[PDB]
């Protein structure tokens, strides 16, 4: 913060007079004032020394000096507000760059979007209620949408007070909304009431300013609502208007000298608006209009606004000073008599100079425009100024859309610049579509979709590469992509370099976002290894970690045309940025709808899980569920019609997504709702029960299972059977056995019989030796343990051996299986050792039930048991909970049962029997009444007490927390079993139908195969249904037609919802409140223009009535103004012709100086020529060469403009013409190549010696003999009352557009000598050119039938 | 576009004279040109004119002339 406090005194200066020049007119109570009297007996802040010269009427340039500023800091109004406001005291003359740098860096203000400058009457302002309402509403609306910059004067009176109240009440009514309408105030430092407390030698970040409306003399108070303040000082005290020029200069610099994004420059829109004012308002408007800032006036508002609007459409020459005074006195009736002739003529000419420029002025017209809005009117004022100035083609309809992107207003982007004849050429909107997509701004996307912006060819490789470099900085995906570029940095991993984000990085991060699937959407390998392109990697000859097939290595790759998924590419980019409204629009135009929606659901679910900790992981999960329902709807619509093709579509692979077939892609999102919908479980019941049927009963297939002859009878229903495809009973038996249902049945029978076999060898075969029926167990454990080894090699990653066993460790049932194996190992050691048979008789009995838990695991099959055993899966830890609970209840009174009664049955480990073991037996029936039963009354009492808490509180209360919790997640438990159903089908489908007694052979079948084979490429027995092009196109085209059919219902569902219909009525009534409130004489006009170029002076007011020499104007006192180059080289030195040195020939050729007028004889007064056209207001020679006409030649070249075929281009009426124009580096304008006619024939050379040629230019000069168009006096801003400009206009033409005269002009060209640029240009009545030169173009256009 | 892929479309048939076509040189094909591409350009419009990109069917009547206007009204 101290950087500002040190920087401001270094840079900014301030004014203060240093000499005492006592004023003759003593001020009111300020008689001790030296013409400024700021704070002293004199006008000085130091010793009023004579300074060796007591110059009377001290010049401000010589007396006033600049001291470094220290009056900066902050202000807080004492009790009026609580926020802090910034303020800086600035010098009268200060570069705008310093001020802008201050407000950007040291004030934390970003670049604006709109610059509206409001000005009006300060002290004497009267307003009607309709006038007050428009400020109350429309200014606030335009300020709070575009994020405009409200710049105005800082004072406590008038229209700025209305602005302050209208900006404070919106902030208060916004209820602490994000962002505030920033307002900056600019006022002169001299006219401040209590500035004495604001001055602080040090950095006054704390400060207090108290306002008082009582002691207001010539001074004024500041406003308490402006957020920033700028105080300009000029040394004076009561001066009014020392802020207008600084504000006007700074506004243009802010608007037109900052924003340059992808091009030369970008000019921010700028608005000046008035309501009602006086002498300062006219000066402000006149100064602002010369800077190119458009001004809009409101009619029926005040005095100045009304008088300006009254002469809106009047011709410039029709204004008369008597008429101006007549309209002035009637609207200024309060102070009409206070106007003098000088003031009347000054205001007349301010009006005249304002109304000369019709392009920069608009009127609100006292509307029937207000009902539309004032927001609109003030906004297409800018866009009208934009149509008024465009160059060389249809850049207007591009610049308007560039502006409309930043407006955040759709109806303005639609209402004018999409209602006219829009030249389609849809490639225009790609630079605008990109901006709309990036800003988001999701609404403009649809608007561009109605206008034919098709996304299929809009999304190029480079466009998406640029899009992925402009992710949301606060988004999680951008942070992830800001890390992969660092995990694989420039030196060690992407060895050449990798500071640029390129498509392989996003492919790699998407693969992490995806599962263990195939290669992601963008090319990894050496063909497109997009990691290492910043160093000069070799071209096509390299083909290793570089570019192989693409065209050129230009710090890019080339046109990788579309990568066969241009829509899904935008869909992923919109999903990762969490743009909910934008992503739905892109999803509509998708090709592979179901796969894209399922992938979006998975990526949203897994991105929500990583990190933001609130408020967006919930929103990401909600959007994931929304896309889940969106996919379910499309699948339901596709499944209703012709379910057979819907199922085939379900299991197909998708080349555009790294295949991830839809059923497989759904599982990793865990997809509770999608897998449980209808046709999904229908297909699951279709792959299970593989080839037989879906109608046969479960109890009827098991009989044909065991009775092998019974397969061949007419009892079971195959699919081969109805097609009578039974040509081999062994073949239909193979088709029977291959189905997963019978593989499961035979496995369950084998596992049910293995337990009986194990029970056989414990009741009778209790021997310490491996008997006849013992090695069967060893081979059985060998066979079943090898299933897990087969699954380890089933679908692993080819690099991770330990990372795949983690998911096996993640299944507690696999842990139960391996523990049952370990318990078998622990019991076998006791089985083989003969001295521990008794411990082996009690340690293997628990294994019989540890295997029963596993046998219960595989009964997640039945329709009424699966969702029923999933309930006891919720019970599992609470099984232990209630076991620990009920064992403690039992023991609590098992201890107390044997206490009172004297029991005497005791042994070794059998006293424990009669003490504890008989307590649980007395619960379920085994009550020794002849043993358990004086204390008989208490035995009744306590026995009733235990069963009162167990059979009543611990038996029936479980039912409540069973049944209620059953109802709680029953929907979840139903779909969880639906989701878990595929896992059983997955394991038993890719498996041979051989018995586990016969799987021993198949365990070696793939081992002997690897004796011959060497690579794992045997077969892929997964769903993974690959499809041909002829059927893929015949299926995706079918789905798209159904996807749009589904979009019909939901779009119709939204409108049919009763709540939405409340939206329709509410906004229709809002359309009723706004619908029922509807109850001459041509002169040298350019010569009289002020602001003489290259000479900072002014010229005297010369009216439209007093312009001619015949009319007498008694006030005419033009200064004898001469340029700095008036006393100079061979040009006439008569700039000071008061001496008798003025003796050159008038109306005659004075040697080489042809000082004779081509129009007629000009009069001579006091030895000096007078302007024959009239009076200009500036006496002297100016920047011209000599007095009278300065003869010069303006050559013009014209040629026809042809089409591609070579025929002439055609207009509506007239024809098409071209001209050749030049642009000098220090001119910033287009002008004709015309030079001064000081030389005889080299006058064209004087303008085109470095432009046309050196030697061939003389040949072109000989061929320059053409036709003359116009001759005589020219209107020019460089015209004084003595030195004007006279020209001759020659026109040469190129009729043919082939090799002829044009051939000579092309080869002879030697332009690049001292000029900036030169080119042929289309002729138009909007082309950029000098206003004087446009007259020559318009006058000479009739000679060849050009347009206009 | 606003019907959101509704069933049925408002069929429109256009009739213009074959003489006044800008880029008809690419439309002429000796064989059956079921595939074809026509690119419109509003720059090289002399006495000729471009076709519309919204009509569903087109009929081009020819009369031997080139810049004749009104050879389609009677047909
Ligand atoms: N900075 C000022 N603050 C307050 N009152 C002022 C100021 N400057 C002049 N006045 C007073 O304003 C009165 C004249 O009011 P109008 O004729 O309606 O307005 P005008 O004098 O033209 O001033 C318009 C004002 O608009 C501002 O944007 C601009 O800086 C200018 O001062 C006079 O009493 C005059 O002393
Ligand atoms: N009809 C006119 N319309 C607009 N500007 C005009 C016109 N006539 C003269 N000017 C301007 O008046 C100024 C003084 O005229 P010159 O500079 O003598 O004009 P010219 O000889 O045509 O151009 C000389 C060039 O030298 C450069 O260094 C300089 O920037 C200027 O463009 C220049 O800004 C010039 O563009």
Q: What is the per-residue DSSP string for A717-786? A: --STTTTT--S-HHHHHHHHHHSHHHHHHHHHHHHHHHHHHHHHHHHT---SS--TTTHHHHHHHHHHHH
The whole-angstrom separation of Cα A164 and Cα A186 is: 14
Pairing relationship of beta strands A361-363 and A1120-1122 according to DSSP bridges: unpaired
DSSP one-letter string for A938-1004 = HHHHHHHHHHHIIIIISSHHHHHHHHHHHHHSHHHHHHHHHHHHHHHHHHHHSS----TTTHHHHHH
Atom index in ligand 2 nearest the CA of residue A1226 equals: 30
CB neighbour burial string for A303-317, b if at least 16 within 10 angstroms, e if fewer: bbbbbbbebeeeebe
Q: For residue A58, which phi and psi values (nearest 5 degrees)? A: -60, 130
Which ligand is nearest to the Cα of residue A246, counting in written order? 1
The whole-angstrom separation of Cα A345 and Cα A320 is: 10
A1249: which 2 tokens?
């010696």
Contact A164, A118 (CB under 8 A): no
A1167: which 2 tokens?
């030895």
The whole-angstrom separation of Cα A632 and Cα A646 is: 13
The whole-angstrom separation of Cα A427 and Cα A433 is: 10
* Helix pair angle (A679-687, A643-650), 10° resolution: 80
Distance A1310 CA to ligand 2 centre (A): 23
The residue whose CB lies within 8 Å of the most ligand 2 atoms, and thus the one to mutate among A1087, A1192, A1247, A1330, is A1330
DSSP class of A535:
S
Q: Point out which residues pair with A1247 in neighbouring strands.
A: none
The whole-angstrom separation of Cα A1003 and Cα A137 is: 84
| Helical (H) or strand (E) element with A1258 | helix A1256-1262
A1204: annotated binding-site residue? Answer: no
SS3 call for A343: helix
Residues recorded for chain B: 75
Contact B40, B53 (CB under 8 A): yes
A19: annotated binding-site residue? Answer: no
Residue B65 forms contact with A (CB below 8 Å): no
A1282: annotated binding-site residue? Answer: no
A162 C-beta closer than 6 A to ligand 1: no
Which among A749, A506, A649 has a CA at the least distance from the CA of A1031? A649
CB-side exposure of A890: number of CA atoms within 13 Å? 16
Sequence-distant (6+) residues with CB within 8 A of A374 are A134, A137, A138, A139, A142, A364
Which residue puts its alpha carbon closest to atom 11 of ligand 2? A1093
A281: annotated binding-site residue? Answer: yes
Contact state of B44 with A1048 under an 8 Å Cβ cutoff: no
Contact state of A1204 with B45 under an 8 Å Cβ cutoff: no
A230: which 2 tokens?
């700028």
Q: At CA A1310, angle to CA A1305 and CA A1312, rounded to 5? A: 135
SS3 call for A368: coil
Contact A1001, A699 (CB under 8 A): no
DSSP one-letter string for A251-293 = HHHHHHSS--SSSS--PPPEEEEESS--HHHHHHHHHHHTTT-
Q: How many helices (H) and strands (E) does chain B have?
A: 0, 2
Tell me how far apart the terminal alpha carbons of chain B are, to the nearest angstrom. 32
Atom index in ligand 2 nearest the CA of residue A1231 equals: 22
Question: What are the distances in angstroms from CA A377 to CA A132, A406, A1317?
Answer: 17, 17, 39
The whole-angstrom separation of Cα A1226 and Cα A1195 is: 22
Residue B56 forms contact with A (CB below 8 Å): no
Contact state of B4 with A1044 under an 8 Å Cβ cutoff: yes
How far off is chain B from A1116, nearest CA to CA, in Å?
Answer: 55
Pairing relationship of beta strands A1235-1236 and A1188-1193 according to DSSP bridges: antiparallel
Cα maximum dimension of chain B: 43
Contact A75, A85 (CB under 8 A): yes
Residues recorded for chain A: 1348
DSSP class of A83:
S
The whole-angstrom separation of Cα A1084 and Cα A1285 is: 12
The whole-angstrom separation of Cα A153 and Cα A183 is: 10
Chain A: residue whose CA lies nearest to B44: A1203
Chain A / chain B CB contacts < 8 angstroms: 32
Atom index in ligand 1 nearest the CA of residue A281 equals: 22
| Chain A interface disruption, residue of B46, B50, B54, most A CBs within 10 A | B46
Which among A279, A351, A343 has a CA at the least distance from the CA of A309? A351
Cα maximum dimension of chain A: 160
Pairing relationship of beta strands A183-188 and A1153-1155 according to DSSP bridges: unpaired
Residue B70 forms contact with A (CB below 8 Å): no
How far off is chain A from B73, nearest CA to CA, in Å?
Answer: 22
Peptide bond into A441 cis (omega under 30): yes
DSSP class of A1144:
P
How far off is chain B from A1205, nearest CA to CA, in Å?
Answer: 8
Distance A349 CA to ligand 2 centre (A): 26
How far off is chain A from B45, nearest CA to CA, in Å?
Answer: 6
A1234 C-beta closer than 6 A to ligand 1: no
The whole-angstrom separation of Cα A598 and Cα A605 is: 11
The whole-angstrom separation of Cα A598 and Cα A586 is: 15
Atom index in ligand 2 nearest the CA of residue A1224 equals: 32
How far off is chain B from A1210, nearest CA to CA, in Å?
Answer: 5
Question: Which residue is listed with tokens 């900052």?
Answer: A258
Alpha helices of A368-473 — where are they, by DSSP H? 374-388, 396-407, 410-415, 430-439, 443-450, 455-458, 461-468
Chain A: residue whose CA lies nearest to B54: A452
A157: which 2 tokens?
């009176």
Contact A20, A34 (CB under 8 A): yes
Question: Which residue is listed with tokens 């988004």?
Answer: A475
Which among A1182, A1192, A1179 has a CA at the least distance from the CA of A1124? A1182
The whole-angstrom separation of Cα A680 and Cα A646 is: 10
The whole-angstrom separation of Cα A788 and Cα A792 is: 6
Residue B32 forms contact with A (CB below 8 Å): no
Contact A223, A192 (CB under 8 A): no
The beta strands (E) that lie in A1017-1125 are given as 1120-1122
A987: annotated binding-site residue? Answer: yes
Residue B57 forms contact with A (CB below 8 Å): no
Contact state of B4 with A1048 under an 8 Å Cβ cutoff: yes
The whole-angstrom separation of Cα A248 and Cα A292 is: 11
Q: Which of A449, A1044, A1203 lies nearest to residue B46, judging by beta carbons?
A: A1203
| Helical (H) or strand (E) element with A699 | helix A698-706
Q: Point out which residues pair with A76 in neighbouring strands.
A: A208
What radius of gyration do chain B's Cα atoms show?
A: 15
The residue whose CB lies within 8 Å of the most ligand 2 atoms, and thus the one to mutate among A1085, A1092, A1093, A1183, is A1093
Contact A405, A444 (CB under 8 A): yes
Sequence-distant (6+) residues with CB within 8 A of A1001 are A994
DSSP class of A302:
-
Sequence-distant (6+) residues with CB within 8 A of A554 are none
Q: Give the 3-state secondary structure of A141-163.
A: HHHHHHCCEEEEECCCCCHHHHH
Residue A1210 forms contact with B (CB below 8 Å): yes
The whole-angstrom separation of Cα A11 and Cα A1037 is: 70
The whole-angstrom separation of Cα A1193 and Cα A1287 is: 5
SS3 call for A1298: coil
Question: What are the distances in angstroms from CA A988 to CA A128, A690, A982, A1000, A1004?
Answer: 87, 11, 10, 17, 19
Resolution of the experimentally solved model in angstroms: 3.4
A245: which 2 tokens?
């020029």
Taking contacts as CB-CB distances below 8 angstroms, the residues of chain B near A1048 are 4-6
Burial of A430 (0-12, 13-18, 19+ CB in 10 A): middle
Question: What are the distances in angstroms from CA A588 to CA A130, A213, A1047?
Answer: 47, 63, 8
The whole-angstrom separation of Cα A544 and Cα B7 is: 53
Which among A477, A479, A719 has a CA at the least distance from the CA of A606? A477
Pairing relationship of beta strands A208-209 and A1120-1122 according to DSSP bridges: unpaired
* Helix pair angle (A341-356, A321-331), 10° resolution: 100
Contact state of B44 with A423 under an 8 Å Cβ cutoff: no
How far off is chain A from B48, nearest CA to CA, in Å?
Answer: 9
Which among A281, A268, A245 has a CA at the least distance from the CA of A148? A268
A499: which 2 tokens?
């500071």
**How many C-beta atoms surround the C-beta of residue A1104 within 10 A?**
21
Which among A17, A53, A62, A61 has a CA at the least distance from the CA of A37? A17
Which residue puts its alpha carbon closest to atom 30 of ligand 1? A153
Which among A1018, A748, A780, A1000 has a CA at the least distance from the CA of A859? A748
A121 C-beta closer than 6 A to ligand 1: yes
DSSP one-letter string for A478-540 = HHHHHHHHHHS-TTTTSSS---S--HHHHHHHHHHHS-S-S--SS--STTB-TT--SS----T
User: Left, alpha or beta for A441 (phi > 0: left; psi -120 to 50: alpha)?
Assistant: left
A1003: which 2 tokens?
């365990």
A1297: which 2 tokens?
């557009």
Distance A1089 CA to ligand 2 centre (A): 16
The residue whose CB lies within 8 Å of the most ligand 2 atoms, and thus the one to mutate among A1085, A1231, A1251, A1328, is A1231
Chain A: residue whose CA lies nearest to B5: A1044
Tell me how far apart the terminal alpha carbons of chain A are, to the nearest angstrom. 59
Residues 2-31 of B with CB under 8 A from A: 2, 4-6
Contact A447, A413 (CB under 8 A): yes
The whole-angstrom separation of Cα A567 and Cα A597 is: 12
Which among A389, A316, A1023 has a CA at the least distance from the CA of A665? A1023
Which among A354, A353, A356, A321 has a CA at the least distance from the CA of A340? A321
Contact A470, A477 (CB under 8 A): no
A906: which 2 tokens?
């005791």
Atom index in ligand 1 nearest the CA of residue A279 equals: 22
Contact A269, A412 (CB under 8 A): no
Burial of A1156 (0-12, 13-18, 19+ CB in 10 A): middle
Chain B: residue whose CA lies nearest to A1044: B5
The whole-angstrom separation of Cα A272 and Cα A274 is: 7
The whole-angstrom separation of Cα A495 and Cα A904 is: 88
DSSP class of A920:
H
The dihedral through the CA atoms of A305, A308, A310, A313 has a sign that is negative
| Helical (H) or strand (E) element with A322 | helix A321-331
Question: What are the distances in angstroms from CA A692 to CA A26, A711, A716, A1258?
Answer: 118, 12, 8, 101
> In chain A, which residues are followed by a C-to-N distance beyond 2.5 Å, i.e. a gap?
933, 1079
Contact A608, A575 (CB under 8 A): no
């Amino acid at each position: 913060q101290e950087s500002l406090s040190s920087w401001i005194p270094e840079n900014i200066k301030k004014k203060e007079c240093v000499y005492f020049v006592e004023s003759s007119k003593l001020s009111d109570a300020g008689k001790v004032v030296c013409q400024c009297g700021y704070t002293h007996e004199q006008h000085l802040e130091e010793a009023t020394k004579p300074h060796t010269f007591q110059g009377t009427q001290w010049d401000p340039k010589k007396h006033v000096q600049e001291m470094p500023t220290d009056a900066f800091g902050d202000i807080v109004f004492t009790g009026l507000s609580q926020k802090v406001k910034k303020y800086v005291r600035v010098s009268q003359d200060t570069p705008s760059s310093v001020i802008y740098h201050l407000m950007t860096q040291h004030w934390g203000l970003d670049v604006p979007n709109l610059l509206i400058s409001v000005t009006g009457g300060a002290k004497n302002f009267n307003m009607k209620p309709r006038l007050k309402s428009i400020f109350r509403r429309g200014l606030v609306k335009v300020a709070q949408t575009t994020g405009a910059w409200i710049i105005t004067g800082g004072s406590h009176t008038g229209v700025m007070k209305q602005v302050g109240e209208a900006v404070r009440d919106f902030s208060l009514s916004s209820s602490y909304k994000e962002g505030e309408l920033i307002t900056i105030g600019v006022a002169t430092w001299g006219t401040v009431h209590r500035r004495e407390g604001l001055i602080h030698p040090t950095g006054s970040f704390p400060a207090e300013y108290i306002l008082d409306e009582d002691g207001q003399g010539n001074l004024t108070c500041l406003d308490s609502n402006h957020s920033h303040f700028i105080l300009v000082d000029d040394g004076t005290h009561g001066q009014y208007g020392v802020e207008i020029p600084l504000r006007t200069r700074l506004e243009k610099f802010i608007s037109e000298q900052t924003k340059e994004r992808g091009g030369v420059a970008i000019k921010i829109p700028i608005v000046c608006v008035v309501l009602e004012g006086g002498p300062g308002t006219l000066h402000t408007i006149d100064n602002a209009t010369t800077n190119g800032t458009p001004c809009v006036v409101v009619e029926g508002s005040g005095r100045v606004a009304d008088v300006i609007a009254q002469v809106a459409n009047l011709p410039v020459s029709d204004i008369t000073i008597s008429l101006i005074q007549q309209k002035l006195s009637v609207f200024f009736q309060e102070m009409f008599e206070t106007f003098t002739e000088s003031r009347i003529v000054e205001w007349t000419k301010k009006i005249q100079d304002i109304v000369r420029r019709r392009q920069l002025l608009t009127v609100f017209r006292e509307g029937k425009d207000g009902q539309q809005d004032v927001d609109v009117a003030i906004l297409q004022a800018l866009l009208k100024a934009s149509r008024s100035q465009d160059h060389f083609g249809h850049e207007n309809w591009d610049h308007q859309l560039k502006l409309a992107v930043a407006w955040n207003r759709v109806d303005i982007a639609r209402s004018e610049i999409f209602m006219d004849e829009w030249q389609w050429k849809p490639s225009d909107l790609h630079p605008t579509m990109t901006a709309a997509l990036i800003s988001n701004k999701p609404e403009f996307v649809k608007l561009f979709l109605e206008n034919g912006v098709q996304l299929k060819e809009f999304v190029t490789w480079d466009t998406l590469l640029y899009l992925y470099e402009n992710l949301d900085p606060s988004c999680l995906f951008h942070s992830k992509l800001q890390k992969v570029l660092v995990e694989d940095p420039e030196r060690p991993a992407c060895a050449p370099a990798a500071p640029r984000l390129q498509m392989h990085h996003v492919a790699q991060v998407l693969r992490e976002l995806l599962g263990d699937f195939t290669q992601p959407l963008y090319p990894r390998p050496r063909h497109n290894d997009r990691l290492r392109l910043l160093l000069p990697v070799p071209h096509v000859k390299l083909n290793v970690q570089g570019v192989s097939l693409r065209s050129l290595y230009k710090r890019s790759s080339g046109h990788v045309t579309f990568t066969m998924d241009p829509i899904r590419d935008l869909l992923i980019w919109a999903i990762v940025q969490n743009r909910r409204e934008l992503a739905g629009i892109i999803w509509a135009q998708s090709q592979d709808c179901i796969a894209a929606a399922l992938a979006c659901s998975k990526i949203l679910k897994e991105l929500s899980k990583e990190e933001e900790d609130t408020d967006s992981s919930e929103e990401m999960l909600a959007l994931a569920e929304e896309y889940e329902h969106r996919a379910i709807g499309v699948f339901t619509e596709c499944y209703r019609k012709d379910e057979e093709r819907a199922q085939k579509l379900l299991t197909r692979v998708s080349e555009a997504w790294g295949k991830t077939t839809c059923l497989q892609l759904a599982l990793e999102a865990k997809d509770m709702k999608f897998v449980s919908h209808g046709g999904i479980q229908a297909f699951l019941t279709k792959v299970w029960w593989g080839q037989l049927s879906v109608d046969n009963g479960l109890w009827r297939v098991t009989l044909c299972m065991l009775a092998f002859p019974l397969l061949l009878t007419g009892l079971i229903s195959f699919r081969e059977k109805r097609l009578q495809d039974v040509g081999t009973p062994a073949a239909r038996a193979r088709a029977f056995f291959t189905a997963p249902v019978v593989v499961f049945h035979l496995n369950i029978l084998s596992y049910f019989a293995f337990l009986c076999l194990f029970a056989y060898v414990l009741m009778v075969d209790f021997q310490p030796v491996p008997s006849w029926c013992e090695c069967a167990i060893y081979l059985w454990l060998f066979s079943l343990v090898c299933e897990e080894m087969r699954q380890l090699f089933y679908d692993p990653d080819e690099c991770g051996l330990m990372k795949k066993a983690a998911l096996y460790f993640s299944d507690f049932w696999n842990k139960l299986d391996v523990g049952a194996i370990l318990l078998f190992v622990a019991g076998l050691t006791c089985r083989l050792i003969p001295a521990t048979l008794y411990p082996g008789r009690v340690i293997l009995s628990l294994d019989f039930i540890l295997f029963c838990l596993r046998l219960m695991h595989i009964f997640t099959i039945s329709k009424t048991l699966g969702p029923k055993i999933i309930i006891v899966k919720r019970m599992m830890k609470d099984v232990f909970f209630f076991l620990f609970l009920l064992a403690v209840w039992v023991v609590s009174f098992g201890v107390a049962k044997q206490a009172i009664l004297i029991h005497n049955e005791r042994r070794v480990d059998w006293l424990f029997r009669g003490a504890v073991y008989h307590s649980y037996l007395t619960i379920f029936g085994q009550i020794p009444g002849y043993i358990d039963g004086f204390p008989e009354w208490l035995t009744v009492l306590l026995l009733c007490l235990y069963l009162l808490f167990t059979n009543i509180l611990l038996l029936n209360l479980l039912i409540a927390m069973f049944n209620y919790t059953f109802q709680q997640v029953q929907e979840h438990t139903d779909q969880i079993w639906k989701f878990q159903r595929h896992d059983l089908i997955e394991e038993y489908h890719g498996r041979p139908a051989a018995p586990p007694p016969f799987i021993l052979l198949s365990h070696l079948q793939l081992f002997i195969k690897r004796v011959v084979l060497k690579t794992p490429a045997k077969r892929h027995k997964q769903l993974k249904n690959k499809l041909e092009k002829n059927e893929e196109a015949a299926l995706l085209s079918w789905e798209i037609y159904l996807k749009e059919n589904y979009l019909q219902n939901r779009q119709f569902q939204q409108k049919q919802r009763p709540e939405q219909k409340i939206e329709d009525i509410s906004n229709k009534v809002d359309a009723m409140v706004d619908l029922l409130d509807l109850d001459g004489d041509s002169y040298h006009v350019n010569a009289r223009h002020l602001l003489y170029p290259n000479c900072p002076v002014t010229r005297f007011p010369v009216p439209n009535e007093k312009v001619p020499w015949e009319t007498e104007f008694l006030i005419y006192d033009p200064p004898f103004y001469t340029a700095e180059r008036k006393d100079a080289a061979a040009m006439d030195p008569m700039g000071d012709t008061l001496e008798p040195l003025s003796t050159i020939q008038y109306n005659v050729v004075d040697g080489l100086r042809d000082r004779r007028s081509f129009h007629g004889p000009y009069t001579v007064q006091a030895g000096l020529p007078l302007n024959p056209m009239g009076r200009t207001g500036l006496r002297g020679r100016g920047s011209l060469s000599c007095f009278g006409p300065n003869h010069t030649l303006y050559p013009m070249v014209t040629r026809w403009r042809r089409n591609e075929d070579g025929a002439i281009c055609r207009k509506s009426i007239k024809k098409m013409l071209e001209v050749l124009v030049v642009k000098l580096p220090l001119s910033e304008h287009w002008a004709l190549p015309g030079g001064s006619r000081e030389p005889g024939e080299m006058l064209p050379r004087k303008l085109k010696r470095i432009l046309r040629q050196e030697h061939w230019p003389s040949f072109e000069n000989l061929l320059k003999c053409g036709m003359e168009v116009y001759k005589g006096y020219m209107d020019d801003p460089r015209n004084t009352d003595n030195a004007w400009i006279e020209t001759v206009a020659v026109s040469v033409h190129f009729q043919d557009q082939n090799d002829v005269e044009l051939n000579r002009l092309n080869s002879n060209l030697h332009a690049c000598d001292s000029g900036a640029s030169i080119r042929w240009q289309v002729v138009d009545r909007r082309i950029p050119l000098y206003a004087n030169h446009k007259t020559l173009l318009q006058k000479a256009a009739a000679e060849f039938g050009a347009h206009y």
